[PDB]
């Protein structure tokens, strides 16, 4: 979890068709977060979802208020998706990011309950700085990734 986010691509199997991957996206993924031991140190509140292009996703902290962390770039049909993220230095929304990153992400179905997904982020370090921290709000632990906490719980 260094300071610095470098571009990476990394891609896993889990147990899901692609569009439960988006379904639940904007039906609850903070909800993930099972009644015992908490993955994330904050407790999640709420979440505000929109489906579309350019499109954006929202969190609300208990004691943090609802803020954009993300964006979008264009929905394809199930088989792939592209996504912006939206989000300031310090968990604050803003007319436009100039640290604004772009990042590829497939989704392809497999069995009835099968689900391959290649997620590349790529020159994000432009937000250089508490990058990782904004990162920590998502939290992705070295031991586990976004892939296998919230694949397991699906
Ligand atoms: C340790 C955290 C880290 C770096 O592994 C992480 O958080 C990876 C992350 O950007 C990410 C990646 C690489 C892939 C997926 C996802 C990741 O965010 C991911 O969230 C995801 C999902 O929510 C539902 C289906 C598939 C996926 C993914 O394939």
């Known amino acids: ?5 470098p571009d990476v691509r990394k891609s896993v199997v889990v147990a899901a068709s692609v569009e439960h991957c988006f379904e639940v996206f904007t039906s609850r993924p903070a909800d993930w977060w099972p009644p015992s031991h908490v993955l994330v140190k904050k407790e999640r509140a709420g979440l505000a979802f929109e489906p579309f292009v350019g499109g954006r996703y929202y969190e609300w902290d208990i004691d943090g208020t609802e803020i ?6 264009e929905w394809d049909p199930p088989h792939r998706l592209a996504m912006t993220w939206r989000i300031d230095g310090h968990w604050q929304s803003v007319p436009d ?5 772009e990042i590829e992400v497939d989704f392809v179905p497999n069995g ?11 020159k994000l370090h432009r937000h250089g700085d508490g990058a990782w921290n904004i990162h920590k709000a998502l939290d992705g632990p070295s031991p586990g ?3 296998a906490r919230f694949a397991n719980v699906i």
Not at 1 to 5: A, G, Q
Not at 68 to 73: A, E, P, S
Not at 112 to 122: D, I, K, P, Q, Y
């Open 1 to 5: 979890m260094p300071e610095e986010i």
């Open 68 to 73: 954009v962390w993300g964006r979008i770039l």
């Open 97 to 101: 990011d100039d640290r604004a990153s």
């Open 112 to 122: 009835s309950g099968g689900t391959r997904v290649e997620l590349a982020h790529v």
């Open 145 to 147: 990734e976004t892939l």
